[PDB]
């Protein structure tokens, strides 16, 4: 045939793949962690957004750390041969490298390891996307007035906030990042490559949001999400 190019992930398998959404709102009292008001808005938006991208969406609410681990183990052991990609959305409390089950923390590394090129072979060479609405620390942004492929390859982490920083959630509108992510997927998924979509998300979050708090420490703060790509190809959600 004519000359071929290898710049873009094959996204025309029979299925787009799984979108696993882990929505942690209510935490065991013993943990001392607050309820995450507004997260259901996020979970609902995410479900609809990925539904229209033709992902097989599975929502799971209020999972323990043990339940998160076993869910990810089990999902990694499914046959993904007929699926183009894998998406996992985590919505919870967190710290750098860590997300919280209802009863305690899970290392992000433990979660993603199940999907390593060598440990989940039906996803080898396919984009594995991890979208994470969770704190990565306690810093606040004051803003300023204007043999073959690596086992860690083909992962993308779309973090809601910069390393070390709090991430902002609005109890009525949902989180800044998830709001903006869904809006930009809705508007551009049939147009832009995914990194270019994620860049629009960065700018929306950075420009359009600023915290209001009665507490001076947490008032007038800003947020910039953080795209971390080990993808080896461009990712378009559409095909021919």
């Amino acid at each position: 045939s004519g000359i071929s190019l290898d710049n873009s992930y094959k996204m025309d398998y029979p299925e787009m793949g799984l979108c696993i959404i882990i929505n942690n709102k209510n935490f065991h009292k013993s943990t001392g962690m607050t309820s995450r008001s507004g997260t259901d808005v996020d979970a609902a938006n995410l479900r609809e957004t990925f539904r229209n991208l033709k992902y097989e969406v599975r929502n799971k609410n209020d999972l323990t750390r043990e339940e998160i681990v076993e869910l990810m183990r089990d999902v990694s052991k499914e046959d993904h041969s007929k699926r183009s990609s894998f998406v996992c959305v985590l919505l919870s409390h967190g710290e750098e490298g860590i997300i919280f089950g209802t009863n305690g923390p899970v290392d992000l590394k433990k979660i993603t390891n199940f999907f390593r090129g060598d440990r989940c072979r039906s996803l080898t060479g396919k984009p594995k996307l991890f979208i994470i609405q969770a704190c990565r620390g306690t810093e606040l942004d004051c803003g300023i007035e204007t043999h073959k492929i690596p086992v860690e390859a083909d992962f993308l982490f779309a973090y809601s906030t910069a390393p070390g920083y709090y991430s902002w959630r609005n109890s009525k509108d949902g989180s800044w990042f998830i709001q903006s992510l869904c809006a930009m997927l809705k508007q551009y998924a049939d147009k832009l490559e995914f990194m270019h979509i994620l860049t629009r998300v960065n700018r929306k979050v950075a420009t359009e949001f600023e915290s209001f708090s009665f507490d001076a420490t947490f008032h007038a703060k800003k947020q910039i999400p953080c795209i971390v790509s080990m993808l080896t190809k461009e990712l378009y959600f559409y095909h021919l």
């Binding site: 607050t34 995450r36 008001s37 507004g38 919870s92 409390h93 967190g94 609405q133 969770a134 704190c135 809601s160 709090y166 991430s167 902002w168 959630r169 609005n170 109890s171 989180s175 915290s211 209001f212 708090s213 947490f218």
Partner: peptide
């Protein structure tokens, strides 16, 4: 507005 709250933090995660």
């Amino acid at each position: 507005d709250e933090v995660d």
